[PDB]
PDB file of N, CA and C and ligand atoms in Angstrom:
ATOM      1  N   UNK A   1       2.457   6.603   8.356  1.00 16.43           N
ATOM      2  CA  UNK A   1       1.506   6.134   9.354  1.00 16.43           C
ATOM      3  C   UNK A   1       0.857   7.340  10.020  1.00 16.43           C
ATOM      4  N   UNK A   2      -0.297   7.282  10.368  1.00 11.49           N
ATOM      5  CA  UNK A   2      -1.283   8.335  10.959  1.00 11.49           C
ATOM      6  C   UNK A   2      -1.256   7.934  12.362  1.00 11.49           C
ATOM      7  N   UNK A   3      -1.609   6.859  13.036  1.00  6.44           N
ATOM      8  CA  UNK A   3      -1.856   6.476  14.155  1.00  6.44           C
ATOM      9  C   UNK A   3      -0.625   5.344  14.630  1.00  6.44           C
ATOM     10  N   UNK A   4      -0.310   5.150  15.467  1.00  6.51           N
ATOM     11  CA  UNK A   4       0.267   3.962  16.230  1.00  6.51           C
ATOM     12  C   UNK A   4       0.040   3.174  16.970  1.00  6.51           C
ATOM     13  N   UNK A   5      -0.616   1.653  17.065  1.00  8.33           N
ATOM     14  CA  UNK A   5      -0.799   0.630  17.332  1.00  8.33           C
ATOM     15  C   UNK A   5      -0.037  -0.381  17.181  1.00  8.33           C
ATOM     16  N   UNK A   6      -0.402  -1.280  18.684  1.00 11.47           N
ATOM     17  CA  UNK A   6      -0.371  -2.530  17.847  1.00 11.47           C
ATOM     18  C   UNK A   6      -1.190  -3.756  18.423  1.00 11.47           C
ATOM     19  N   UNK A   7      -1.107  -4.936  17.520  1.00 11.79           N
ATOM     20  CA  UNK A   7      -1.704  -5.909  18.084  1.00 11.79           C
ATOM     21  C   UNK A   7      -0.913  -6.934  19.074  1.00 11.79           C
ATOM     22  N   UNK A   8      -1.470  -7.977  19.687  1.00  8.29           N
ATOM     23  CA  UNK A   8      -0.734  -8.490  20.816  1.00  8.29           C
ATOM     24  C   UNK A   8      -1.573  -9.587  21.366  1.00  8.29           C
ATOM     25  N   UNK A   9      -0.733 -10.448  21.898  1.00  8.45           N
ATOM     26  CA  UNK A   9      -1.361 -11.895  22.531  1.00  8.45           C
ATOM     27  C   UNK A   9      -1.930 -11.567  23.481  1.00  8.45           C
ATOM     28  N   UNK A  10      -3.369 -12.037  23.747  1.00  9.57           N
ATOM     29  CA  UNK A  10      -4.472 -11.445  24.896  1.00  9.57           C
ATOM     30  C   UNK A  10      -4.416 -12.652  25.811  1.00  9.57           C
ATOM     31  N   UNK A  11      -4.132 -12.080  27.111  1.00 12.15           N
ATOM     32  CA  UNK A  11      -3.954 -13.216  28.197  1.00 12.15           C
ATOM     33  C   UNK A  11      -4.979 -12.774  29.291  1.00 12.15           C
ATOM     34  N   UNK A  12      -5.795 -13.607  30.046  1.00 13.18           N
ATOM     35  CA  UNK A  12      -6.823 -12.956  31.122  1.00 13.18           C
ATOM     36  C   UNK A  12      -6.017 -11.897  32.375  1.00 13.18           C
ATOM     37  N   UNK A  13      -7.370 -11.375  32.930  1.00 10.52           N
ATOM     38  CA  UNK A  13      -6.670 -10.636  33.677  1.00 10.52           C
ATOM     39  C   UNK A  13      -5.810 -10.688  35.303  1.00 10.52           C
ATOM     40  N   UNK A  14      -4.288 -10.651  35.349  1.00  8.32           N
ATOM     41  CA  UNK A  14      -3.708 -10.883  36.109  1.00  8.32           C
ATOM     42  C   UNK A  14      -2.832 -12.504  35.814  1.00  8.32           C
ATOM     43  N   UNK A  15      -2.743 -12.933  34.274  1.00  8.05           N
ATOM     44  CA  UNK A  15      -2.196 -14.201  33.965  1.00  8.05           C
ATOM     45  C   UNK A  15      -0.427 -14.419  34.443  1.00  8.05           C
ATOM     46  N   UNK A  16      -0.221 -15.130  34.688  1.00  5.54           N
ATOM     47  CA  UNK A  16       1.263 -15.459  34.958  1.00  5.54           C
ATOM     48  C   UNK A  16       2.516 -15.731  33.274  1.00  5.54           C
ATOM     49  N   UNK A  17       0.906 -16.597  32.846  1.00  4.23           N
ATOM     50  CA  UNK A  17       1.797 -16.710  31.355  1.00  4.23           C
ATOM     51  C   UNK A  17       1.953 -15.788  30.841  1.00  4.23           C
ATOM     52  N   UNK A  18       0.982 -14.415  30.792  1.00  5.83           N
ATOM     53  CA  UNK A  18       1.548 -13.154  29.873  1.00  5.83           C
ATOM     54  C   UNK A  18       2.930 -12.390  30.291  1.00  5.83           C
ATOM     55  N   UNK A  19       3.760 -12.734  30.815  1.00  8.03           N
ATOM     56  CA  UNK A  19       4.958 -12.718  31.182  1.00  8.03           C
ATOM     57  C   UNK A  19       6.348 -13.769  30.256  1.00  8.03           C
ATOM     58  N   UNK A  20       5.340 -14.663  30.004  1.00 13.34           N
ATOM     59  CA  UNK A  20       6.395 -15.715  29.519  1.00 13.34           C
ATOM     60  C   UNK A  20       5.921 -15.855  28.184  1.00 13.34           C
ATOM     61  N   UNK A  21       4.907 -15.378  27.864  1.00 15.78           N
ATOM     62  CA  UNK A  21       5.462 -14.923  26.382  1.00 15.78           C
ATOM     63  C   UNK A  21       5.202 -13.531  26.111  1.00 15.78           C
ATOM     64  N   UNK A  22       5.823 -12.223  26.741  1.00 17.88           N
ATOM     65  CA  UNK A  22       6.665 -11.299  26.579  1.00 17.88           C
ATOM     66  C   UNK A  22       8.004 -11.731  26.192  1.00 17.88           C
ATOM     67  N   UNK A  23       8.589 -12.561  27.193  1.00 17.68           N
ATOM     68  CA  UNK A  23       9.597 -12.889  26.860  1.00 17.68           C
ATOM     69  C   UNK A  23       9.874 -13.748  25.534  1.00 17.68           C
ATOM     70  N   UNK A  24       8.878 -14.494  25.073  1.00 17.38           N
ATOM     71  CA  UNK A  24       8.658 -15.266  23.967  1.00 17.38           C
ATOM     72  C   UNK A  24       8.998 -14.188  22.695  1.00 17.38           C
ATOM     73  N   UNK A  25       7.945 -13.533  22.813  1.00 15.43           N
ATOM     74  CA  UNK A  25       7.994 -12.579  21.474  1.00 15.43           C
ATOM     75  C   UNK A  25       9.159 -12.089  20.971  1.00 15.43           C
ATOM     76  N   UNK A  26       9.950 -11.183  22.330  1.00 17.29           N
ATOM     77  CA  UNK A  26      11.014 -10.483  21.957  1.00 17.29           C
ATOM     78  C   UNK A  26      12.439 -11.549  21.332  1.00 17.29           C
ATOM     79  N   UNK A  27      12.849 -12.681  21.710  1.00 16.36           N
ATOM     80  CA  UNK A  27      13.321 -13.774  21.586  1.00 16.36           C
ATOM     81  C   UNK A  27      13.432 -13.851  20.059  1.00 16.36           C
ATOM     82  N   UNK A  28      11.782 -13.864  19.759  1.00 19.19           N
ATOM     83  CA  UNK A  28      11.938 -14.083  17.583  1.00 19.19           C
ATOM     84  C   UNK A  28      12.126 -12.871  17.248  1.00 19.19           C
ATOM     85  N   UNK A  29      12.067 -11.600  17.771  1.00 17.60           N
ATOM     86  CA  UNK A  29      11.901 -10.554  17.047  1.00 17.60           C
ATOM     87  C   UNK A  29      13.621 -10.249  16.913  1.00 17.60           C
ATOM     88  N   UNK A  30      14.490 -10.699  17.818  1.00 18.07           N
ATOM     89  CA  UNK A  30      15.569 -10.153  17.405  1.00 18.07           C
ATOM     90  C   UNK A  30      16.514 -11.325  16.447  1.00 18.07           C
ATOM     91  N   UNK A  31      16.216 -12.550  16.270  1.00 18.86           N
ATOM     92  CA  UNK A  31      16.307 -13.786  15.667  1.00 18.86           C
ATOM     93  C   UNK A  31      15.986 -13.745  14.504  1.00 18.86           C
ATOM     94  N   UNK A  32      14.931 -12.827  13.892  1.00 20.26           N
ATOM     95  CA  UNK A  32      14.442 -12.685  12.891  1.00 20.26           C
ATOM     96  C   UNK A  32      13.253 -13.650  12.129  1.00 20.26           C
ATOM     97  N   UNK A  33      12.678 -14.381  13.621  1.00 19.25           N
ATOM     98  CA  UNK A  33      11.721 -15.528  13.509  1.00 19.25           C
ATOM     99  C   UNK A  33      10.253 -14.661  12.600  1.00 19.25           C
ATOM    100  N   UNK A  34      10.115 -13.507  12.807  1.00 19.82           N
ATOM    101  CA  UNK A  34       8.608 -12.703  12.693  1.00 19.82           C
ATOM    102  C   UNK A  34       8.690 -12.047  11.240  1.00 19.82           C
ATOM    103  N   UNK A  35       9.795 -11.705  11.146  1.00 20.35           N
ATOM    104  CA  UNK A  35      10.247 -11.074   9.778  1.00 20.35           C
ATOM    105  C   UNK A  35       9.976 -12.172   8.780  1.00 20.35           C
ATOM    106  N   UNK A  36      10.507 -13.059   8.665  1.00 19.29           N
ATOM    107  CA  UNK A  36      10.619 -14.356   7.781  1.00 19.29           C
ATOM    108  C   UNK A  36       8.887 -14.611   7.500  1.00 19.29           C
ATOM    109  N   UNK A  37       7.941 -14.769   8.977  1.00 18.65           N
ATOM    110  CA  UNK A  37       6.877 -14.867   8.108  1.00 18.65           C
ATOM    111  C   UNK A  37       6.020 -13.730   8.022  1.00 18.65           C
ATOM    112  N   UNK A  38       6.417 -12.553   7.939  1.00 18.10           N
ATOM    113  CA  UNK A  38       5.698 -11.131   7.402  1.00 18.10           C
ATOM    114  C   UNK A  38       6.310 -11.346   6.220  1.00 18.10           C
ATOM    115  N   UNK A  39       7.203 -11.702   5.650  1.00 16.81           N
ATOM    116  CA  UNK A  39       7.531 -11.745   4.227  1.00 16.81           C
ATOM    117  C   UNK A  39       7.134 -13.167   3.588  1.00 16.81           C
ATOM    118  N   UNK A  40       6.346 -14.516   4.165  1.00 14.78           N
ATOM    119  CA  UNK A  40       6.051 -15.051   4.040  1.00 14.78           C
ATOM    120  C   UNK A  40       4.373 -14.798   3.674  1.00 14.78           C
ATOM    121  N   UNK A  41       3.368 -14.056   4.225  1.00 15.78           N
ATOM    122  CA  UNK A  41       2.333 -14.117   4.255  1.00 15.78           C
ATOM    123  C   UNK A  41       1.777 -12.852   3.350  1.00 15.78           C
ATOM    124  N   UNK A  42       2.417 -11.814   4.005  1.00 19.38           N
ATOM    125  CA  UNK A  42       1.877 -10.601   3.361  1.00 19.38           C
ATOM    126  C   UNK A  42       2.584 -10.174   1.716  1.00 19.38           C
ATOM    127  N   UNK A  43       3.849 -10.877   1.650  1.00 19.23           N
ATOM    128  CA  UNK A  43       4.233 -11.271  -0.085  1.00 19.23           C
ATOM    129  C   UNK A  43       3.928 -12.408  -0.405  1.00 19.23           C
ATOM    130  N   UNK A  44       4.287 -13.102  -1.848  1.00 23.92           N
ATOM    131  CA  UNK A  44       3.781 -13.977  -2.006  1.00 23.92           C
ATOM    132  C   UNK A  44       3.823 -13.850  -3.961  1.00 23.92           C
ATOM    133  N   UNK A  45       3.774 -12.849  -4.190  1.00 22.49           N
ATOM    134  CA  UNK A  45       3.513 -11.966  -6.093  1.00 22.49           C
ATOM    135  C   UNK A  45       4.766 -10.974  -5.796  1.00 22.49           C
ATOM    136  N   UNK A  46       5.515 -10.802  -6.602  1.00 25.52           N
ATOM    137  CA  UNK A  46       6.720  -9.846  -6.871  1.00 25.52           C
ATOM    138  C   UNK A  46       5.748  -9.090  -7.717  1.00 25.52           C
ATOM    139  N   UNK A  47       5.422  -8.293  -7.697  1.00 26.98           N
ATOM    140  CA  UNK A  47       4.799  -7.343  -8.604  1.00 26.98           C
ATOM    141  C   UNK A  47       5.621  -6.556 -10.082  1.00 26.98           C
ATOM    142  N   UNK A  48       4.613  -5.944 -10.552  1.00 28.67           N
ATOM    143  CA  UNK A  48       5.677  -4.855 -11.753  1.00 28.67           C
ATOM    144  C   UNK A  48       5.420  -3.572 -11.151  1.00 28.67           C
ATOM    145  N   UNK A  49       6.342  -2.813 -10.809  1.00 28.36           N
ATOM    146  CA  UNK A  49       5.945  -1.559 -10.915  1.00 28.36           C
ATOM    147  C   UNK A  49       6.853  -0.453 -11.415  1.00 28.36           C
ATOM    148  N   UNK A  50       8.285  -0.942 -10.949  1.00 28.23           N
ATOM    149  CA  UNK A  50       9.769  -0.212 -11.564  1.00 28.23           C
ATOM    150  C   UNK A  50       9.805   0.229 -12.601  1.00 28.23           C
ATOM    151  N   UNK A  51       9.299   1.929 -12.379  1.00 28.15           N
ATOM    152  CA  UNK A  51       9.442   3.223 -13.104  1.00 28.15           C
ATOM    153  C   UNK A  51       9.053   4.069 -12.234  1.00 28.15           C
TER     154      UNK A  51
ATOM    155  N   UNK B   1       1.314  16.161  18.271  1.00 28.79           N
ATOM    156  CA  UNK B   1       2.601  14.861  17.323  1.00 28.79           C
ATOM    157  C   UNK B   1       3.309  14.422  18.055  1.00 28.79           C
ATOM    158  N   UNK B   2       3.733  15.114  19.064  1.00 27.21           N
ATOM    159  CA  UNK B   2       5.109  14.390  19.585  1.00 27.21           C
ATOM    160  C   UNK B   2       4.388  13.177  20.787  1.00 27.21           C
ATOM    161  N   UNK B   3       3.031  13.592  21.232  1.00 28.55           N
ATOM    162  CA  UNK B   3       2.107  12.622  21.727  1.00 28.55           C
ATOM    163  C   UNK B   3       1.600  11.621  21.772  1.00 28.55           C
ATOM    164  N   UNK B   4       1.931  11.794  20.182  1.00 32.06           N
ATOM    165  CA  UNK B   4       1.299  10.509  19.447  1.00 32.06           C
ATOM    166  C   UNK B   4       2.442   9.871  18.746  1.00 32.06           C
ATOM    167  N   UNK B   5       3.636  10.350  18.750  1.00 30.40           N
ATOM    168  CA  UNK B   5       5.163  10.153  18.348  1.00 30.40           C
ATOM    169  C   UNK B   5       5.642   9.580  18.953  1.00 30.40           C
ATOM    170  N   UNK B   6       5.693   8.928  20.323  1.00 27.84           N
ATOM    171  CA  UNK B   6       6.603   8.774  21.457  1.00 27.84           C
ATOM    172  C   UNK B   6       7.189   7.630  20.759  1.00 27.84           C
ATOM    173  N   UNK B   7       8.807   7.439  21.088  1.00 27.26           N
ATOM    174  CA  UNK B   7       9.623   6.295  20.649  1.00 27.26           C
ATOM    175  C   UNK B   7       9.850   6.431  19.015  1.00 27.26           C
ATOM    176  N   UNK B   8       9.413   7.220  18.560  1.00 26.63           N
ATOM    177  CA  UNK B   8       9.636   7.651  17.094  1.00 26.63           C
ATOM    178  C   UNK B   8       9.979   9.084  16.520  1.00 26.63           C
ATOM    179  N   UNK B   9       9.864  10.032  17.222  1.00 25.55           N
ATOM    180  CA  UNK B   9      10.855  11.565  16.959  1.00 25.55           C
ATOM    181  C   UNK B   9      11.196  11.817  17.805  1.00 25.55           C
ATOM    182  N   UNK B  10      10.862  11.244  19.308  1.00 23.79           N
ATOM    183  CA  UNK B  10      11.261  11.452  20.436  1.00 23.79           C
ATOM    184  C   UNK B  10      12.579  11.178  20.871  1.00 23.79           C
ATOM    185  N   UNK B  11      14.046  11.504  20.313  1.00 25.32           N
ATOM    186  CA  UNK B  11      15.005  10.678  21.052  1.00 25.32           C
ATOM    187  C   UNK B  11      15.649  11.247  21.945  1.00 25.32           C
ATOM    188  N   UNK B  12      16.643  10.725  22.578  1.00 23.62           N
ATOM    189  CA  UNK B  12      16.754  10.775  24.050  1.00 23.62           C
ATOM    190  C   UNK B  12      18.163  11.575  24.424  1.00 23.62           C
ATOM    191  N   UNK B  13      18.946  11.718  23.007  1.00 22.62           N
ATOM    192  CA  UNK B  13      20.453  12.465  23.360  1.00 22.62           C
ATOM    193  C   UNK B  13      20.221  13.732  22.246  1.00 22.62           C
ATOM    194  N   UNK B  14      21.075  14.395  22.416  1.00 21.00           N
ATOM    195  CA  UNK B  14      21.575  15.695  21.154  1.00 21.00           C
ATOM    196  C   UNK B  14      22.286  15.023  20.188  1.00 21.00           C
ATOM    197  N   UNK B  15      23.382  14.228  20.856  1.00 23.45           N
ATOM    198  CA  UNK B  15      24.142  13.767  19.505  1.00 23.45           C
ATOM    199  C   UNK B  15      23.316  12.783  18.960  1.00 23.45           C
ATOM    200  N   UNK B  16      22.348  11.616  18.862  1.00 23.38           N
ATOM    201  CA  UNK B  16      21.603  11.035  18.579  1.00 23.38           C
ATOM    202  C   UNK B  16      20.220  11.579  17.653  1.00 23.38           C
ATOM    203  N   UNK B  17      20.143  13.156  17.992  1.00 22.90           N
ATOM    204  CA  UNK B  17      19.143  13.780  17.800  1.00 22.90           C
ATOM    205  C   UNK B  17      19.661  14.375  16.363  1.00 22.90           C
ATOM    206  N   UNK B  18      20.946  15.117  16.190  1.00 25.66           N
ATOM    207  CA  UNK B  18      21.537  15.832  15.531  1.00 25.66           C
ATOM    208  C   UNK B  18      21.590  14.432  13.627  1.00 25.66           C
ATOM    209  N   UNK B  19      22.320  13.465  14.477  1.00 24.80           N
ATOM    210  CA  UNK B  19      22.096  12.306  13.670  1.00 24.80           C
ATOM    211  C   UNK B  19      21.028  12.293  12.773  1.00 24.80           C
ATOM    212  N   UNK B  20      19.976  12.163  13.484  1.00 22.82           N
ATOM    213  CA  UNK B  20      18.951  11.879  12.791  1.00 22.82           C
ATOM    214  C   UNK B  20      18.553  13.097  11.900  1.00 22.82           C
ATOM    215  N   UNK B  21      18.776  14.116  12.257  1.00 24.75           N
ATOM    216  CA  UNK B  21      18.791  15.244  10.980  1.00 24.75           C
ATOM    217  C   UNK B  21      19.325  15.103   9.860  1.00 24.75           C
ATOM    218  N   UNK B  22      20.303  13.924  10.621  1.00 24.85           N
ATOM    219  CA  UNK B  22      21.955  14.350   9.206  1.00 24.85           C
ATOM    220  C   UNK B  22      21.505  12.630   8.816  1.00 24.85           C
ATOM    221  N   UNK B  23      20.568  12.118   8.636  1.00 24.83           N
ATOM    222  CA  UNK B  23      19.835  10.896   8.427  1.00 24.83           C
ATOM    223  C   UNK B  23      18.873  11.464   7.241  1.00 24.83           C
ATOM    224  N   UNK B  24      17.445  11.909   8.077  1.00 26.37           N
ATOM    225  CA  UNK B  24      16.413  11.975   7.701  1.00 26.37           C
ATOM    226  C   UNK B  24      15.958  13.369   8.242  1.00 26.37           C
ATOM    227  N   UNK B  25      14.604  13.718   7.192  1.00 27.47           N
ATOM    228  CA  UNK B  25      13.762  15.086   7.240  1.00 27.47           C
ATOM    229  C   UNK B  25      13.635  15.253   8.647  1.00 27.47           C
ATOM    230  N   UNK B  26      14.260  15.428   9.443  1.00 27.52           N
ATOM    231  CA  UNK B  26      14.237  15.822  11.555  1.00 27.52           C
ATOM    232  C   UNK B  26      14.589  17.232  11.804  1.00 27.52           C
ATOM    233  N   UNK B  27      13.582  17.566  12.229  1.00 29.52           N
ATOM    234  CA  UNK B  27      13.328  18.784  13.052  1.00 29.52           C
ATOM    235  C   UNK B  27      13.297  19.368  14.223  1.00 29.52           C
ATOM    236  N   UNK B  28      14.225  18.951  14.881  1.00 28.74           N
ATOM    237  CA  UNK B  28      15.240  19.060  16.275  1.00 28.74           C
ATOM    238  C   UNK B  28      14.760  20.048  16.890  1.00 28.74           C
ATOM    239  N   UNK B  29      14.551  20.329  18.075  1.00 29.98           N
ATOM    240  CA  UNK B  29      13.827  21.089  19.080  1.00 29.98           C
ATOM    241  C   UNK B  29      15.175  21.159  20.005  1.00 29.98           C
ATOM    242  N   UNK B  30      15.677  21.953  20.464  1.00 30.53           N
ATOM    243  CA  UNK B  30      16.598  22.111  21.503  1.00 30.53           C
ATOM    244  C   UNK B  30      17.236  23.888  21.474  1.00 30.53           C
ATOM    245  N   UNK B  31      18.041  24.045  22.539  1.00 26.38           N
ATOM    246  CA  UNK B  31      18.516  25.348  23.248  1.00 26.38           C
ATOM    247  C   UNK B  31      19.312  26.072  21.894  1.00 26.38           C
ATOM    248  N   UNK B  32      18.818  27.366  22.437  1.00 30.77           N
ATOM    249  CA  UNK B  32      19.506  28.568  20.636  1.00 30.77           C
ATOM    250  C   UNK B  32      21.263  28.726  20.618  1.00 30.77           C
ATOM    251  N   UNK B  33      21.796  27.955  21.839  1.00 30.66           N
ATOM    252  CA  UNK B  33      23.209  28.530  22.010  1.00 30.66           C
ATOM    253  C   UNK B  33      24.047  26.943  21.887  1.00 30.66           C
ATOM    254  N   UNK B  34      23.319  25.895  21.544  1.00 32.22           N
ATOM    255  CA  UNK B  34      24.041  24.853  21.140  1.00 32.22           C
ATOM    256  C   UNK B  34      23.816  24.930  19.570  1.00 32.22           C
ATOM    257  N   UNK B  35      23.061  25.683  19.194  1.00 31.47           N
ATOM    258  CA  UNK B  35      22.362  25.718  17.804  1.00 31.47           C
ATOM    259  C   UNK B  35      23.592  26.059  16.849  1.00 31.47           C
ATOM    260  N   UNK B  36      23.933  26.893  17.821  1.00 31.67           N
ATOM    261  CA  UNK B  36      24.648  28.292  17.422  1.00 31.67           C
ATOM    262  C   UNK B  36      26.765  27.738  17.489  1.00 31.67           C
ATOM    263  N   UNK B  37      26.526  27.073  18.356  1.00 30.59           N
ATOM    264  CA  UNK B  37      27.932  25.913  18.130  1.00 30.59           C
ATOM    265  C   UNK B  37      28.244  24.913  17.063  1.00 30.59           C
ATOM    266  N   UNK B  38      26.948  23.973  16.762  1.00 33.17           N
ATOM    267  CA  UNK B  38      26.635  23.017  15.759  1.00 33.17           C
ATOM    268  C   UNK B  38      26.948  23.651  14.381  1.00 33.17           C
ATOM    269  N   UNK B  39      26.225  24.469  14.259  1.00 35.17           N
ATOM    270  CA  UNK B  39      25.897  25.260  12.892  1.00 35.17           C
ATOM    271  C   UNK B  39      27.192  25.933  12.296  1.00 35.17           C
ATOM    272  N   UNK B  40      27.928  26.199  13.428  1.00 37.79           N
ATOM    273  CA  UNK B  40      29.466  26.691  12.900  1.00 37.79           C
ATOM    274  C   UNK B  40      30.624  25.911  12.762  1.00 37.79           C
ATOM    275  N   UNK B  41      30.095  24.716  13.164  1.00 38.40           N
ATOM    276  CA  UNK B  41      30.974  23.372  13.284  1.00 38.40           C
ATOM    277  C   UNK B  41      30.479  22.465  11.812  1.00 38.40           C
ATOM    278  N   UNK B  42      29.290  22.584  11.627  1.00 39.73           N
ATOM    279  CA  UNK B  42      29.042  21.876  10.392  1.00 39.73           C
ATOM    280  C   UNK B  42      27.872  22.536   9.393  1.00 39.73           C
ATOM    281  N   UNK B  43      28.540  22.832   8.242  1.00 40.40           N
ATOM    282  CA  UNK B  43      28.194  23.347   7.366  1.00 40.40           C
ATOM    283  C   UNK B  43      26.968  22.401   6.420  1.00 40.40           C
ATOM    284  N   UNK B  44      25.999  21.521   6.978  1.00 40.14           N
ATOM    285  CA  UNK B  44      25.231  20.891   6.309  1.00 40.14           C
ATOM    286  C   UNK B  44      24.101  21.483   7.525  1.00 40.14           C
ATOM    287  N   UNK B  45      23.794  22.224   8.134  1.00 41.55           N
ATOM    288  CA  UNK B  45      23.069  22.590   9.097  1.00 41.55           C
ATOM    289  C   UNK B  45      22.791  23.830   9.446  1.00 41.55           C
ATOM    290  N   UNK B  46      21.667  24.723   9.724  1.00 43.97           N
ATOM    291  CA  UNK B  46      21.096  26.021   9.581  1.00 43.97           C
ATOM    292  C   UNK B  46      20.461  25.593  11.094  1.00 43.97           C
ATOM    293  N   UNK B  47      20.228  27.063  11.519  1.00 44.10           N
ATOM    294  CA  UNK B  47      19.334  27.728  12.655  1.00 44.10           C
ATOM    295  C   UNK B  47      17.474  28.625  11.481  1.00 44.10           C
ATOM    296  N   UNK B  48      16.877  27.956  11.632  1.00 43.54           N
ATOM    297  CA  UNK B  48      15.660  28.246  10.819  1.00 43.54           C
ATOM    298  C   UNK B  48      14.437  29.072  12.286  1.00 43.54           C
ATOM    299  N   UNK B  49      14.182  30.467  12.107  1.00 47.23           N
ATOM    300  CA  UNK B  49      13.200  30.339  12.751  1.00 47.23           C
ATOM    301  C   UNK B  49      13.800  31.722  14.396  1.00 47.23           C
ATOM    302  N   UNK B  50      13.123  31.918  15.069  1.00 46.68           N
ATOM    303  CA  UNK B  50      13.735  33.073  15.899  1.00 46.68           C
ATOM    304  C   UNK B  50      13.817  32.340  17.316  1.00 46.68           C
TER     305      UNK B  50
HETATM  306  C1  NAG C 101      27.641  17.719   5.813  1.00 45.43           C
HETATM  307  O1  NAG C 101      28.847  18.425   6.392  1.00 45.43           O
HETATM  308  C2  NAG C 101      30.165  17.999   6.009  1.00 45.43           C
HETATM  309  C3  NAG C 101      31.084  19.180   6.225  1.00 45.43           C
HETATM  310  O2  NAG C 101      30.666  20.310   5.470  1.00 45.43           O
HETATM  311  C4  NAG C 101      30.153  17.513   4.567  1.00 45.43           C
HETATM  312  O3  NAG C 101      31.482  17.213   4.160  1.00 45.43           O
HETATM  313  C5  NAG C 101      29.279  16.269   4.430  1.00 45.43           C
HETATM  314  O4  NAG C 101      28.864  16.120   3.077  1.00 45.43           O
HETATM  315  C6  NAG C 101      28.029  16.280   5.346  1.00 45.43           C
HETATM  316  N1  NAG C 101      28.199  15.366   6.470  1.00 45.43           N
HETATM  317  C7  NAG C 101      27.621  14.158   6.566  1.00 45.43           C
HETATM  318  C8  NAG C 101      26.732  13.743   5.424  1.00 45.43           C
HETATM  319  O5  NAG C 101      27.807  13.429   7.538  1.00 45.43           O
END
């Protein structure tokens, strides 16, 4: 990686809910809710490449 | 780099730091007289540099 970002749920400015899903996010991320569909969306083809 | 690194070469202990050498390609920044303890304590580790 060259740069570091990331993307993120956009809530207006000064929202109450962007608090409650902070807490949302982190919840699947250690559950393994986000993983399941990054390997859901961005695979999909097992490729050949093994050599 | 280390600017644009934060939370990723940046860590926060020696022994944590040392780890990650004895992990992965890490290039540890710290004092010449702990260098100098480590290095005689474990033989997978060099002082590179003045
Ligand atoms: C590097 O150092 C020790 C002691 O020389 C060696 O036995 C071992 O292979 C390495 N230690 C690791 C990989 O933790």
């Amino acid at each position: 990686l060259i740069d570091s970002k990331g993307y993120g749920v956009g809530t207006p400015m000064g929202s109450p809910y962007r608090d409650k899903i902070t807490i949302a996010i982190l919840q699947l991320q250690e559950e393994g809710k986000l993983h399941m569909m990054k390997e859901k969306w961005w695979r999909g083809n097992g490729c050949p490449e093994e050599e | 780099f280390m600017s644009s690194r934060r939370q990723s070469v940046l860590v926060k202990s020696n022994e944590e730091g040392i780890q990650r050498v004895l992990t992965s390609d890490y290039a540890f920044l710290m004092e010449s007289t702990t260098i100098e303890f480590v290095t005689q304590r474990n033989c997978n580790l060099t002082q590179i540099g003045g």
